[PDB]
C-alpha cells in the first residue's frame, strides 16, 4: 500500500463510543441538524486510552470528520467558528502527538479511511470501503478510494526509489535505467487507475456536497481568522483544507526527478511546501531525505546516455500526462459545476508547466 496506513483500524476502544457514534452517523446527524448538538454535549474524553498508532490515526480521522461536519454543518454558510473544548482539546492533543495540524488531512480521509470487504482478496475498488462519509450521496467512497487506489498504484514506484539512488552511487547504468522505466510504468498505471474518478464520483455531488467538507479555514472568507480550538489555543488558527498536495507519494516524484515544484517564492511552490506540513512526519521526512540526495536529473544529464535520458523523460512525461488528465478532471468536477476558480487552474497549469519544462527532449 506504500504510504497508505496498512489495514487501518475500524473500531476505537469502547471508551470512545460517543465519538465513534457521531462519526458513523454524520449523514443523518448533519441532515437532521443534530450534529452540532451531539458534539456540544460530548464529554471530554482523554486520548490516553488510544494505545497504538492505528488507534490514534482512526481517532484523528474520527475527530477530523466530526470537526469538518461541525464547522460546516450543511455547508450552506451557517458555519461554526469555535470548535467546542471537549472535542478541540483531545483533537489538538492527538494531532500534536501525530504531528498533524488539527484539521482533516489527506492522510486521514484517504490513507486511514478504508477497509477491505474480504480481507482475503486484493485491494480493488470492488473489495473496499471507506470508514466514514459526510453526507448521503457525497461520493466520498469514490473520491477517497480512487485517490487511494491511484496512490497505491504510484506507491509501487517507491519500492524502486532506493534502487535509483544506489544505482547512481554504485554507478550501475542498467540498474538505474530499468529503475526509471519501472517508475514510469507505475506512473502510467496510476494514470489508468485515475480514470476511475469518472466511474465513482459524480461531478454535481463532489462540487456541491463533498468539496464543502474538505474545505479548510486558511484564507477562507467564511472563517476569516481561522477556527478557535476552544480551551487549547486562545486565538483562532488557520489551517488548509485537505488536498492531494498533502500526499508525499504525489509530491515525491517531482523531488526524485529534480523537478523543483517547491523552489522559489511563487504561490504554487509555497502551497506545495505548505502541504508538507499536513503529511505524517515519516512521510515528510521521506521527502526531505529525497531532497538531500544527489540529483537524479543531474546524473542523467551528465552521462551523455540517450537511453538514460529516455528513461528519465518517460517519468517526466507520465507526470505530465497525469497532470493534464487531472486538469481535465478539475474542469469537469469544479469549473463546469461552478458555472451551474481561475487561481486554481493557474496553480495546476503552473505545476504541469514546471513538470514539462523538466523534459530533456522536447
Ligand X SMILES: Clc1cccc(-c2c[nH]cn2)c1
C-alpha cell at 195: 480514470
**Which one of residues 114, 132, 217, 333 is an interface residue with ligand HEM (CB under 6 A)?**
333
Residues 137-156 that bind ligand HEM (CB under 6 A): 143, 146-147, 150
CB of 58 to ligand HEM, least distance (A): 23
Between the alpha carbon of residue 16 and those of residues 20, 103, 250, the distances in Å are 6, 19, 33
Report yes or no: 46 and 89 within 8 Å, Cβ to Cβ: no
- Give the residue ranges of DSSP H helices in the chain: 17-24, 26-32, 35-40, 53-72, 85-98, 106, 140-155, 161-169, 173-194, 196-200, 203-205, 211-214, 248-256, 267-275, 281-292, 296-301, 306-330, 336-338, 342-356
Choose the one of ligand X, ligand HEM, none that binds residue 123, judging by a C-beta under 5 to 8 angstroms depending on kind: none
Work out what residue 99 binds among ligand HEM, ligand X, none; the CB cut-off runs from 5 to 8 Å by kind: ligand X
- Residue 52's alpha-carbon distances to 66, 97, 185, 255, in angstroms, are 21, 11, 36, 31
CB of 35 to ligand X, least distance (A): 20
Least gap, CB of 125 to ligand X (angstroms): 14
Of 16-24, 44-52, 90-98, 238-246, the segment contacting ligand HEM by CB under 6 A is 238-246
Binding ligand HEM (rule: CB under 6 A), the pick from 163, 175, 208, 243 is 243
Q: Select the residue interacting with ligand HEM from 5, 105, 186, 329 (CB under 6 A).
A: 329
Nearest residue (beta carbon) to ligand X: 242
What is the sign, positive or negative, of the torsion defined by CA atoms of 293, 298, 303, 307?
A: positive
Report, in Å, the least distance between residue 92 CB and ligand HEM: 23
Binding site for ligand HEM (CB under 6 A): 143, 146-147, 150, 194, 197, 201, 206, 243-245, 250, 323, 326, 329-330, 333-334, 344, 347-348, 351
Residue ranges at the known binding site for heme b: 326
Amino acid at each position: 500500500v506504500g504510504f497508505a496506513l496498512p489495514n487501518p483500524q475500524e473500531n476505537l476502544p469502547d471508551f470512545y463510543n460517543d465519538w465513534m457514534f457521531i462519526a458513523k452517523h454524520l449523514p443523518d446527524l448533519i441532515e437532521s441538524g443534530q450534529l452540532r448538538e451531539r458534539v456540544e454535549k460530548l464529554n471530554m474524553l482523554s486520548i490516553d486510552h488510544l494505545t497504538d498508532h492505528k488507534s490514534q490515526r482512526l481517532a484523528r480521522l474520527v475527530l477530523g470528520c466530526i470537526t469538518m461536519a461541525y464547522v460546516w454543518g450543511k455547508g450552506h454558510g451557517d458555519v461554526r467558528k469555535v470548535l467546542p473544548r471537549n472535542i478541540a482539546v483531545p483533537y489538538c492533543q492527538l494531532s500534536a502527538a501525530l504531528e498533524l495540524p488539527p484539521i482533516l488531512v489527506y492522510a486521514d480521509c484517504v490513507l486511514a479511511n478504508w477497509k477491505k470487504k474480504d480481507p482475503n482478496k486484493p485491494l480493488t475498488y470492488e473489495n473496499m470501503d471507506v470508514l466514514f462519509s459526510f453526507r448521503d450521496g457525497d461520493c466520498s467512497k469514490g473520491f477517497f478510494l480512487v485517490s487511494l487506489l491511484v496512490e497505491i498504484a504510484a506507491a509501487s514506484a517507491i519500492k524502486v526509489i532506493p534502487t535509483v539512488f544506489k544505482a547512481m552511487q554504485m554507478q550501475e547504468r542498467d540498474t538505474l535505467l530499468k529503475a526509471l522505466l519501472e517508475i514510469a510504468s507505475c506512473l502510467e498505471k496510476a494514470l489508468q487507475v485515475f480514470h476511475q474518478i469518472h466511474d465513482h464520483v459524480n461531478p454535481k455531488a463532489f462540487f456541491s456536497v463533498l468539496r464543502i467538507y474538505l474545505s479548510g479555514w486558511k484564507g477562507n472568507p467564511q472563517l476569516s481568522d481561522g477556527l478557535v480550538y476552544e480551551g487549547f489555543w486562545e486565538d483562532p488558527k488557520e489551517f488548509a483544507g485537505g488536498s492531494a498536495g498533502q500526499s508525499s507519494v504525489f509530491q515525491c516524484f517531482d523531488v526524485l526527478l529534480g523537478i523543483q515544484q517547491t523552489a522559489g517564492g511563487g504561490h504554487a511552490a509555497q502551497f506545495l511546501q505548505d502541504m508538507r506540513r499536513y503529511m505524517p512526519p515519516a512521510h515528510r521526512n521521506f521527502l526531505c531525505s529525497l531532497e538531500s540526495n544527489p540529483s537524479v536529473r543531474e546524473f542523467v544529464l551528465s552521462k551523455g546516455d540517450a537511453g538514460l535520458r529516455e528513461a528519465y523523460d518517460a517519468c517526466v512525461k507520465a507526470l505530465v500526462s497525469l497532470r493534464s488528465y487531472h486538469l481535465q478532471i478539475v474542469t469537469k468536477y469544479i469549473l463546469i459545476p461552478a458555472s451551474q476558480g481561475t487561481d486554481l487552474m493557474n496553480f495546476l497549469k503552473t505545476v504541469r508547466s514546471t513538470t514539462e519544462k523538466s523534459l530533456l527532449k522536447e
